[PDB]
């Protein structure tokens, strides 16, 4: 937390939004360094929520706990009575949290095997269709579009084929499983021996599950619409603070972060929404000061409202 927290710079009697509170790293730290603040502590795993709730008994004048998405932030801000134009800083680290990688059944992680599951929003949606749901279903095309766009992945093509053929012998529904197939795309002389193939960066199917985790959480558009309501709701003055993990969301944040306007769904055809893929963070007056760019597999990228 700490080149997150020294970016923010906290002091007495400021206000911060932490929208992405995960195992409460970045809120803790601030707290170590300035007690005397208010934190609305957001997230929209209820795991994660349950958290921010259990500090929020220790710091009770302090901490204000919240379950939501990105999306869902302004309304919930709203009814709080929060105003715009208040924070002194906001918070955005993107990166999953332990929780959602360290435990197996949640299926977001290569390690261990569980259902394919990937949804950060945990039991909250049991409608919300899985990463199980969206590869048992999606046709050749379509998991192919997803894989190449979202996890910018080369092999889009083979991969998407290979799920295809293996979903006919049997339903794919755990992690492990999904992974096998990814391997099982490639001759054994592309891969054989070829130990960073397993390990936790550069896995053969890194990509395939970054690419379904941001289909299933939507997490293009909600960025960008989180991004929104932080500058809505920050101060003048106020810093916003960043963490990206992957190169869409990072050119998300550079974009936004330089006033460069981005698709909205909103200006989309619904032929467009319904057949497409989102182009948000591909390759195809002043509102900020932009103070920091760091790398800590990791991009920090912090800015002042002006």
């Known amino acids: 937390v700490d080149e997150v927290v020294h970016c923010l710079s906290p002091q007495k009697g400021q206000i911060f939004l932490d929208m992405t509170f995960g195992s409460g790293g970045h809120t803790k730290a601030i707290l170590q360094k300035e007690s005397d603040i208010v934190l609305y502590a957001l997230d929209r795993d209820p795991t994660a929520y349950a958290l921010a709730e259990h500090l929020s008994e220790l710091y009770p004048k302090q901490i204000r706990a919240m379950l939501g998405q990105f999306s869902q932030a302004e309304a919930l801000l709203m009814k709080a009575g929060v105003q715009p134009g208040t924070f002194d800083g906001v918070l955005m680290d993107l990166g999953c949290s332990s929780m959602q990688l360290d435990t197996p059944e949640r299926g977001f992680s290569l390690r261990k095997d569980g259902p394919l599951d990937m949804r950060m929003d945990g039991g909250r949606y049991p409608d919300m269709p899985t990463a199980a749901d969206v590869v048992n279903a999606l046709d050749q095309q379509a998991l192919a579009s997803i894989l190449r766009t979202y996890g910018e992945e080369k092999h889009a093509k083979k991969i998407a084929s290979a799920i295809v053929q293996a979903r006919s012998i049997y339903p794919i529904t755990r992690t492990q499983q999904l992974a096998s197939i990814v391997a099982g795309a490639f001759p054994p002389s592309a891969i054989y021996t070829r130990k960073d193939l397993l390990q936790r960066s550069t896995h053969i199917a890194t990509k395939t599950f970054q690419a379904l985790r941001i289909f299933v959480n939507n997490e293009l558009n909600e960025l960008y619409t989180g991004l929104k309501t932080a500058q809505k709701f920050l101060r003048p003055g106020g810093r916003l ?66």
């Open 241 to 306: 603070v960043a963490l990206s993990f992957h190169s869409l969301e990072d050119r998300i944040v550079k974009r936004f972060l330089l006033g460069i306007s981005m698709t909205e769904r909103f200006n989309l055809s619904v032929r467009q929404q319904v057949m497409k893929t989102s182009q948000l963070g591909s390759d195809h007056p002043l509102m900020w000061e932009l103070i920091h760019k760091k790398v800590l597999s990791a991009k920090l990228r912090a800015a002042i409202k002006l």
